[PDB]
Write a protein that holds these residues in place. Sequence first.
Motif: not given
Lengths: 49, 49, 20, 20, 69, 66
Positions: B16, B25-26, B18-22, B13
């Motif tokens: 997630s 990162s998934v 700070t993860c870049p939505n790309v 958590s």
Amino acid sequence: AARRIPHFYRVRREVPRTVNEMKQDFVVTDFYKVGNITLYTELHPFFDF
Amino acid sequence: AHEYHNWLRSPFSRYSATCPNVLHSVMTLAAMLYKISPVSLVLQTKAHI
Amino acid sequence: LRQLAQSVQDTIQHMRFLYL
Amino acid sequence: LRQLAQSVQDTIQHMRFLYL
Amino acid sequence: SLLHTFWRLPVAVFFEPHEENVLRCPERVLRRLLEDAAVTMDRVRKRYLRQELRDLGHRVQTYCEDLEG
Amino acid sequence: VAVFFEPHEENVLRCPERVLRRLLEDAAVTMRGGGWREDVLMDRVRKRYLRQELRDLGHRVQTYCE
């Protein structure tokens, strides 16, 4: 065979793994190490023993 | 609230947030789920991961 | 000829009976 | 005049596909 | 059904596969092998002979058809 | 932990309560007369020679008719 192919899977027992399959799950650099089992099978670059 | 008994914990958590939505990162939330069983430490070693 | 053809066919069927 | 024997020439490979 | 043994009291084992043999089969394994063994399992020649008799009759009809010319 | 029995010459496996012996005798007498696996080879060679001579009859009826 064309009707025995659903009859082949009427068993639920697997086949053991072939040797030529077992020579492919090593990476480029551990294959010379003793952790490989199949080094007594690789004898010649033109044949499979 | 059973974080020490859950299967997924706070560093997921906290990743997630700070993860870049790309796509990449998934993918890294998948390989953060490698088990630390001894046999899991064998295959990752043998694949040089 | 024609009788020869008919006779050779009926005799060859009679010898076909001695396989089964 | 000679297709009358071609008829049996047909039927023998007919029964070859049938019986065998 | 079940066996009848000479020695009355059982004996424990300590051996290896390379030593003497022993039947040690778990129950679901023998059950599944029984399922796999259970599930894995002429007058047409007289019919051909009688149809060949009918072909013989057709052929003698052809012989009676051919000689009339 | 494991418990077993040491083999002998006097230990005997009994009949399976005669409920499977009777189907053993059924399988005994349902196959006394049947496929002998002997004339199957004769069946194959007779079928093949019969096909050969029937095709020979085809060649004879195709050429001798002209």
